[PDB]
Design a protein around this ligand. Structure first.
Ligand SMILES: NC(=O)[C@H](CCC(=O)O)NC(=O)[C@H](CCC(=O)O)NC(=O)CCc1cc(-c2ccc(-c3cccc(Cl)c3)cc2)no1
Ligand SMILES: [Ca+2]
Ligand SMILES: [Ca+2]
Ligand SMILES: [Ca+2]
Ligand SMILES: [Zn+2]
Ligand SMILES: [Zn+2]
Length: 159
């Protein structure tokens, strides 16, 4: 078992907003992505605008201040740090992607589900059905379900 948050109340903050989407659509996608994980664990997530936010959500491009530089449009879509203080837990999204509420460009919701999985301590899954599989693929939000493997993984960390 890798690092996990040692509390069940976890805050997040949206540092900045991609211009690709309306602001309310970014809020909604991120909120719904957290809800995917709280639906199957004892964890609760609250959005705050300053202060001690555990998970900082950031949109940035190329070299952006950590050791995980982005690569322009395509390739790496986002990355996130596992539980820990400071940069720990933070989720970074490559602004060179075109973020969407839908199937065009890169769907922010699904990518956020994957990245939050990392922010909570999950590694990649070798199961192609799992949201933690390494490669992105689109599916409608209304049809999306965590896989049994994703649920096994997150419940092994938090119950
Ligand atoms: N196919 C690709 O490789 C794409 C885009 C290609 C491009 O335009 O160059 N890039 C990415 O995928 C990069 C790859 C980084 C690397 O090269 O290793 N991945 C990263 O950046 C990881 C981020 C990521 C992965 C996912 C994901 C979404 C849905 C499912 C899902 C599971 C089951 C059923 C269904 Cl329908 C969907 C699984 C994973 N969201 O954000
Ligand atoms: Ca943090
Ligand atoms: Ca990229
Ligand atoms: Ca963009
Ligand atoms: Zn980063
Ligand atoms: Zn990943």
């Amino acid at each position: 078992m890798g690092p996990v948050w040692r509390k069940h109340y976890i805050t997040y903050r949206i540092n900045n907003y991609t211009p690709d989407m309306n602001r309310e659509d970014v809020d909604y996608a991120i909120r719904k992505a957290f809800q995917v994980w709280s639906n199957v664990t004892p964890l609760k997530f609250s959005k705050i605008n300053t202060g001690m936010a555990d998970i900082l959500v950031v949109f940035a491009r190329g070299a952006h201040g950590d050791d995980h530089a982005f690569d322009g449009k395509g390739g790496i879509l986002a990355h996130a740090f596992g539980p820990g203080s400071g940069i720990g837990g933070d989720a970074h999204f490559d602004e060179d992607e075109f973020w969407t509420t839908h199937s065009g460009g890169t769907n922010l919701f699904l990518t956020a589900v994957h990245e939050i999985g990392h922010s909570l301590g999950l590694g990649h899954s070798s199961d192609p059905k799992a949201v933690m599989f390494p490669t992105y693929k689109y599916v409608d939000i209304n049809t999306f379900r965590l896989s049994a493997d994703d649920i096994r993984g997150i419940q092994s960390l938090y119950g």
